[PDB]
Amino acid sequence: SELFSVPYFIENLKQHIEMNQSEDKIHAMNSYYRSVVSTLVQDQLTKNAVVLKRIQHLDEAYNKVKRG
Amino acid sequence: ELFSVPYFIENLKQHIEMNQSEDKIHAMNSYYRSVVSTLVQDQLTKNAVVLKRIQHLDEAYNKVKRG
């Protein structure tokens, strides 16, 4: 719900997995992960603390989705 | 030297070669995810420094991928 939050990334990670049925679930997650981090880290407008927190959110979303 | 671009380029290549179940691109993504996770768990390095390490990793990734 909240922009760039854990549930936000959990939702996106789940949908990305569902949209790529010709790739391994874990690999689809890592692809989405690399692309998101790359975009966030290239952001020269958002505060470092905010950008880092967003990556932390994505990371937690990844760990949660992986368990399920 | 640590967590620098050349550093990640070297380690990316080592994982790609040592890995026995993932091809080039898949190995890079798995290495990347695993490293960023660690770097993000860092609770004693300044946030600016942490991001800078992740930026170098991304730059190394982009270089090894197009190269």
UniProtKB/Swiss-Prot annotation, chain A:
It comes from Bacillus subtilis (strain 168). Transmembrane segments: none annotated. It holds the Pfam family YvfG. It comes from the Bacteria. This is Uncharacterized protein YvfG. InterPro entries: Uncharacterised_YvfG, YvfG_sf.
Swiss-Prot record, chain B:
InterPro entries: Uncharacterised_YvfG, YvfG_sf. SUPFAM superfamilies: YvfG-like. This is Uncharacterized protein YvfG. The lineage of its organism: Bacteria, Bacillati, Bacillota, Bacilli, Bacillales.
